[PDB]
Design a binder for this molecule. Structure first.
Ligand SMILES: Oc1cccc(-c2ccccc2)c1O
Ligand SMILES: Oc1cccc(-c2ccccc2)c1O
Ligand SMILES: Oc1cccc(-c2ccccc2)c1O
Ligand SMILES: Oc1cccc(-c2ccccc2)c1O
Ligand SMILES: Oc1cccc(-c2ccccc2)c1O
Ligand SMILES: Oc1cccc(-c2ccccc2)c1O
Ligand SMILES: [Fe+3]
Ligand SMILES: [Fe+3]
Ligand SMILES: [Fe+3]
Ligand SMILES: [Fe+3]
Ligand SMILES: [Fe+3]
Ligand SMILES: [Fe+3]
Lengths: 289, 289, 289, 289, 289, 289
C-alpha cells in the first residue's frame, strides 16, 4: 500500500557539516529552509531531504508516499484495523512538509513515520546539482532506500509487510563475527529492489545508512573521489549480491550513520522470487578505515 | 467510465470569424454542415468541432465518448443511481450528432453534456488541413481538453470523478493576484494528462479555453505565427509544469475564450501519482497583450 | 469465449475447379484427403480448408477454436444455459476433423458450427505453397474471417456475442442501392479486426466470402494477377475503412461466393471502441465485372 | 556530375485543366506565378513544376541540379570539352527560375535542359497539399523522374552518361507488339533507381510521362481514386520489375503525356549491378482504357 | 502454483563417471558437497544438481520452487485439501538443501518431490563452466525439464495439474512401434514450453531424461562433439515439433537415463493453445546407436 | 574485379536424377530449358544452375559476374595483359546464357569460365521452391561458392587473385591422412567469406562440391532430412572454423561431387585479416558413410 519513500528528515549536531556534505560532496541542491530545517533537492520535488539541528544526530522521520487522497484514507483504515496509533497532520504540518495530507505515526521501535500524498513540485526551478552528478534516479522508485536497525526483526517484519504493505525481496546473512551473522531483510514497495531493509545490528542509531542512486557509473566514481577528499570513505566500490547496485559507502557528519552512493541496480516486479545470500557483495565493498 | 472527449459544439456571434479562425489559423478541415452548425474535422471522424450561431459566444455542449452500447447503458445506470437527470437523445439528435446512441444531461453548473458511442468515421475522405499542420494527436486520447470554469470546485469534483469517472491528475495553484490563487484541478479519463480541468475563475464563460495537440513542434511554431499575424496571440510559447505540453495561447473570435495549441505532452497511466504545482509553466507562457 | 476461426469446410459442385483454385491461384498447399474431403493447408495445421463434393456449393461448416479441454466444457455449459442444441462429436468425427474434442451445433440460421480444441499440427511436413505466396497470417488470429449472410442481424448478433462471445468491432452501412443500405456488423474474438461479419444481404448463400491474409503486399499483388489470369477478379485492389486491410476480391468456383486476399490490416485489443462507417473502402475496391 | 532532377516546365494548351490536375488530383500546392508560368510546389522549394501556355502540350524544359557554384563551372567544362553548345542564363532567367546560376543547353534531340545550382527554398511558407497526400519523396533524390522519348537510344545514351554523368541502372524490353520490343534504358544520378529513362517509343512527345513519389501506400491509393473520378486512369496499380515502385498511371491534360504516382521504390548505390528485365511490372499495371 | 523446477538429485552407481559427465561433458561447475552428495552449479544458485551414491541409478528427488513463504503455506493447504501426504522438512534438511523452507512428498507413483522457497545464491562465486558453454538458460524458467515415466498418465495428469498447478501445453503421440504410440503430455508452470512431461513408457526408470538449455547454438554443437567423443550420443541434432528446441540426446552414466542439451526453444504464455503432434521432431533427432 | 559467382552449368550422366535432386531435395525451382540444358532458379534470376547431358558428370562451366559493360571491357583488358586467351561470346551464346555480354576463357587447369554482365531477371515469375525452403541467400554475394580442385595451388592462386581479382580469406590445412594435409585456400570477391576455394585434392573432379546458402537454420535442418531420406547424406550438421557456416554435405547424382547446404555464415570486408586453421569444422561435420 505504501508506494515509495519520498523524503527523509535528519536531526543533526552539525548542520553546517551536513549542508556541506549533502551539497559539495553528494551533489544535492540547496533548496532554502522550512522552519529550522534546511531543505535539499535531488529532482523536481520541492525538497527530498531536510536537515534541522538536534542532539539526535539520527533520522528524525521518513515520509512514505501514496498516490492520492483515497489511498491515504485507505492507509488510515489499515492503521486503524491494525491498532496502530496515528495523528492526522494539521494544516501547519502540511504546510511545513508541503504535502496535501498526511498521517503521523511511529514504527514498532520509535521511528516517526509520515504517510503522505500530494507532494509539491517546482518544475519552474530546474534541479541544479551543487556538485558534478548527471542526476538522481527517483521517480516511481522514490528517493532511495535506508536500512532500519531493529531489536526484533520478526516484530519489525510483521509491521512493515502486514501493516504497511512492503514485500520481502530477499535475505542476506551479514557476517558480524566468526560465528555471528545478522539476517538482513530487504523489502520493496515498488520497482526499487528495496526501499527499506530491516537488520538487528548492534548499532545505537535508528538507521545504518540511507542510499541515493545516480544516473551513471561515472557519477558514482566522481562522487567517490569527492568523499575520499573529504576523508569520509568507509568502503571501496563494489556490487551487491541481491540488488546488483554498484556503489561505495561513506560517513555522514553524524557518527555511525553512513550514506551509500550507487548506480545500475536490478529492479523487482510481480515475478520476483525470494532468495538468500551469504554475502552483501558479489565483488568489492572492501571495508575502509 | 467516460473514455475520452470526442467533440465540442460552440454557439458564437461571429460564425464567419470562427470559420476563418478554425481553418486558416488552427488548420482544421471544413466538413460541411449539420443543421445550422458548420462542422470541422481534425482527423478521420465526420466532425470534431461544430460551430452554430448564438448570442452565447461560448461552448454550447461537449460530447463524452464511451466504447460501446453496453458502456452507454452502464452510464445511464450511474446517472440514474447518482440522481442525475438525463434524456436519451432521439433519432433526430443521433442523426444530427452522427452517433449510434447518446444521453443528454448537464454538469452541476449548466454545461450541456452528451455521452455517446458509435461515432461516424469517413476514411474515404482523408483529412486535409486548411493550414500547414502535419496532423493532430487524437485517437484514444480524444480531441483534446478544456478548462471548465466552476463556482464550486469541490461540487464540480464530486460530479466529474464520482459520477463520470474522471480521475484527478494533479493541482496547480494559479496565481490570480498578490494574495490570491485559484486551485485548478486537472482530470484524466485516459492517457491524456488531462481531458477536463476545473477551476474557480472570475470569468463569465463556461470555459477558459479548449486545447488541440499537434504532431510536431514545428506545427505549433508555425501555428503561432499564423495566429500572431491574425493578432490573436495571448501568450508566448511555453511548457507546462504538470503535463509538460509545449504550447501557446490565442484568443478565439469569442470574447474571453481562448485556444491552446500544443505538442509533446506527458501521458498518464495506472502508476500516476497526485502532485501539486505552484506555477502553470516550467518556462515560457509569458502573458501577451 | 471462442478464441478464433480455425477451419472451413465447403461442399461444392466442382471439386477439381476448387482444387485448382485453392492451390494454383490462392497458393494453398494440397494436404491429401479425409474421407471424401480434399484437404488444404495454409500453415502448420494438418488442414485449414476442406473441400468435399455436394450440390450446396456453399460453406458446409466452420470450426471455432478454444484453447483447451476445460474451455470446451465451459462452452458446453454456455450452449446448455442458452438453450442451444449441440451434439458432442464422436470418435470418428474427432478422427475425421483431427481434433481432440468437439461440439457440433448450428447458428440460428442453419450454419453448422463445430467448436473444438486440440488441433493436429505437422511441423515435420513444412508448409509449401502451391503458388508464390511468402506465407499466410494465421496464428492466434485464426485462419481468417468470413461474412455470414443472415435474414435477421439482431437475432444473429445476440447469438454470436451473447452465446459465442464474439465482440462487435464496428458497423459499415454497405450501400445496396439509391435508398438502400445493409448495416454489416463486424465481430472479433481476438486480435483480427474481425473473424465473422453479419450482414442481411439479398444473396442465396450462407456466406458472401471468406478471407485469407498474406504476409506481404506483393503476395496480394501477385495473387491478383493469378486470379485475373483465371478470369475471376471481382474487384480491384483497395483498402477497407474499418480493418484497413489492403485486398482484392475474386470469385470462387462456387456461384455467388467470393474470396478476399488481403494484407496489412489493423488489429484490435481491449481499447477498441465501436465506430460507424458509410463506405467499405477508404480507397480502391472498384467493383469489376 | 548532375546530382538530381530539380524542376520541370510544361508548355500546355489547357492551363486551367493542368492547374486543376496538379492541385486537386495530384495534390501539389499552388505557388503563384513567374511570368506567364503558374508555379506548383511539392516540398520546401519555391517551385518544382511550372506550367505556362503553349501549343506544345509537352515538357518545355528540365532543370538538372548540381550542388554548388564550382560544380556548375565543372559542368561548363564538360559541355565545352564534349562540344555541347550552351548559354549561361542571364540575370533575368536566374530571377525567373529562382536559382543562383544556370547553363542552358539541349539534349541531342531538342529537349531544352537547364543545369543549375542554388535553388530558392521557402521554409517560412510550409508546403500544404491541395489534396490529401502526406507528402512527396524528393530531397537528395530530386523531384522524381521522367521517360525521355528518343529516336536513337545509343546516341541519347552517350550524351546522358558520357556528358551528363548519369549511370545505367538496367534495361527493360518493353513489348510493343508480337515481335516488337523497345529496350528502355533506366539511368540514375543518385539514390533514386532512375531519374531519366531513354526509350525509342513511337510517340510524338518529348516524354512518355513524369513520375512523382508519395510518402505512403495510401497516398497512392487515394490518388488513384481521385484521378479515376477525373476519368484519367490509364493503368491499374502495380509494382515495377526494376525499381519496385508501386504505382499507377494516368493521363495529364496533355494528349499522350501521362503521370505516374508511386511509392516505396528500391534505391541504388555503389554496389548496383546492371540487369535486364522482360516486363515493366512484376505484378499489376494492367493497361486501362 | 509451482513456479518452476529448481533442482534435481540423482542416486547413482558411478559417482566418478557422473562427476566427469556433468563437468567435462555437460559443462557444469563442481560446487563441493553436501553430505554424501556432490553438488553441481549451472548459474548463481549454490547448486542445481546433486549426485550421491546409490543402487537406484535414477532421479532420487526433484525440487519444485515457489516464490515465498506464503506461497509455500498455500501449497501445504492444497496438498492438505487434496489428501496428499507430506512432511515439512526439518532444520537439517533445510540446511542440506540450502533452502528457507520445504515440504517433502511424493507424486502418485513414488517420485520424491520437495516444494521449497528461499534458495541460496552465491553471486560472490561467479559460475565458471567446467567445459566451453557460454551459459545456461534458467532464471524464471527454472533449471530445465524432465520426462516423468508413469504407468497411468491420466492419474499422473490429475495430480500435476489439479494438485501442483502445472498446465498442459500439448501432446505428442510418440511412435513406439507399427501400431503402438505413447501419448506424451507436456506441462508448463511458467514460460518454459514444458518443465515436466508425462509419458507411459516401457522403461524401468523414474524418468526418461532431464534437459538443460544453453545460451547459444554453438554451445549445443560443441557439447555434441564432447559427448560424441565420450561415446554417449544417442541422437543426432534436431528440432522438436512442440517446443522448437534444437538439441541432441546422450546417455548419462546411468543405464536408460539420458540427457538432452538444447537451445532456442519457444516459450509459452497466457495465449497458449493446446495442440497435438504426431512426431517429436520437425527435423533431425535421428536415433543413434 | 570479378564481383560474384552468378551461375553454374553441369554436364551429367543422369539428368532425371539431377532434376529430382535439385528440385525435390535441394528445393530449387524448375525453370524450363535452354537448348539441351534444363534450368533451375534460386531467386529472381532467369536461371542460376543449368544441367545438360554429358559423360563428364562434372561442372561444365562457371559464370563470373561483373557490374556493367565497362567492367567487362576492363576484364578483357586484364586477360589481355595477363596473356590469358578468351573469346567474346557471340549473339547465340549471349541468348543461350541470357546475358548482355560475356567473355569465354578457362582457368589454368581447364575449367571453362564465363565472365558476364547484364543478367536476365524475371520478377514477374516469383521464385517458388520445389521443396520447403524459405529462400536462398544470394544477392550481392552471388549464388554461393565452390571448391576448385587444382594440381598446383600456387599456380591457381596467382591466376584467381592476380588475374581475376579474388582475395585470399584464409587457409585451412585439411587433414588427408596421418602425416598428410592439403592447404585449402579460400578466396572472396565480395561479402561472402569465400566464393571459390582452391585445394590440391586427390579427386578426379573439377570441383569437390558447390554450396548453397538458405535463409534459416530450419531450412538446413529440413533439407538434411530430405537428402537423408534420399540416402545422400555424406556428413552430419556442423559449423566451419573459417566462415562459421552451419551446414551438412550430401552426394549429388554425380560420383565424387557433393553439395553443401548451409546457413548463417560470417561475411568479409575491408578489415578482413588472413588467418590459418587446422580443422574445417569448429564442431560437427562428422563424416557419414
Ligand atoms: O543496498 C544493499 C544491498 C545488500 C546489503 C546492504 C547492506 C550492507 C551493509 C549493511 C547493511 C546493508 C545494502 O546496503
Ligand atoms: O494545459 C494546461 C496545464 C496547466 C495549466 C493550464 C492552465 C493555464 C491557465 C489557465 C487555465 C489552465 C493548462 O491549460
Ligand atoms: O474485410 C472487410 C471490411 C469491410 C467490409 C467488407 C465487406 C465488403 C463487401 C461485402 C461484405 C463485407 C469486408 O470484407
Ligand atoms: O518507373 C518505371 C519502371 C519500369 C518501366 C517504366 C515504364 C513503363 C511504361 C513506359 C515507359 C517506362 C517505368 O515508368
Ligand atoms: O523436449 C521434448 C519435446 C518433444 C518430445 C520430447 C521427447 C522425445 C523422446 C522421448 C520423450 C520426450 C522432448 O524431450
Ligand atoms: O565452406 C567451407 C569452409 C571450410 C572448409 C570447407 C571444405 C571442407 C571439406 C572439403 C573442402 C572444403 C568448406 O566447404
Ligand atoms: Fe544500502
Ligand atoms: Fe490547457
Ligand atoms: Fe472481408
Ligand atoms: Fe516511370
Ligand atoms: Fe526433452
Ligand atoms: Fe564449402
Amino acid at each position: 500500500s505504501i508506494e515509495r519513500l519520498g523524503y527523509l528528515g535528519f536531526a543533526v549536531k552539525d548542520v553546517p557539516a551536513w549542508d556541506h556534505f549533502l551539497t559539495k560532496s553528494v551533489g544535492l541542491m540547496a533548496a532554502g529552509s522550512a522552519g529550522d530545517a534546511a531543505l535539499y533537492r535531488a529532482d523536481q520535488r520541492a525538497w527530498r531531504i531536510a536537515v534541522q539541528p538536534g542532539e539526535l544526530d539520527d533520522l528524525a522521520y521518513a515520509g512514505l508516499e501514496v498516490d492520492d487522497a483515497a489511498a491515504l484514507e485507505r492507509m488510515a483504515d489499515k492503521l486503524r484495523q491494525a491498532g496502530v496509533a496515528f495523528t492526522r497532520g494539521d494544516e501547519a504540518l502540511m504546510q511545513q512538509r508541503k504535502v496535501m495530507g498526511l498521517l503521523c505515526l511511529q514504527d514498532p521501535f520509535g521511528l516517526p513515520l509520515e504517510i503522505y500524498y500530494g507532494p509539491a513540485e517546482i518544475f519552474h526551478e530546474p534541479f541544479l546539482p551543487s556538485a558534478p552528478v548527471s542526476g538522481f534516479v527517483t521517480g516511481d522508485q522514490g528517493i532511495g532506500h535506508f536500512v532500519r536497525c531493529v531489536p526484533d526483526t520478526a516484530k519489525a517484519m510483521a509491521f512493515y509487510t502486514e501493516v504497511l504493505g512492503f514485500v520481502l525481496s530477499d535475505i542476506i546473512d551479514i557476517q558480524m563475527g566468526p560465528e555471528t551473522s545478522v539476517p538482513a531483510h530487504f523489502l520493496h514497495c515498488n520497482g526499487r529492489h528495496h526501499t527499506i531493509a530491516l537488520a538487528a545490528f548492534p548499532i545505537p542509531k535508528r538507521i545504518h545508512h540511507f542510499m541515493l542512486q545516480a544516473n551513471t557509473i561515472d557519477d558514482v566514481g566522481y562522487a567517490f573521489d569527492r568523499l575520499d577528499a573529504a576523508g569520509r570513505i568507509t568502503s571501496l566500490l563494489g556490487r551487491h549480491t541481491n540488488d546488483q547496485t554498484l556503489s561505495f559507502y561513506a560517513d555522514t557528519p553524524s557518527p555511525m550513520i553512513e550514506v551509500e552512493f550507487g548506480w545500475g541496480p536490478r529492479t523487482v516486479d510481480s515475478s520476483w522470487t525470494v532468495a538468500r545470500h551469504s554475502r552483501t557483495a558479489m565483488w568489492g565493498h572492501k571495508s575502509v578505515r
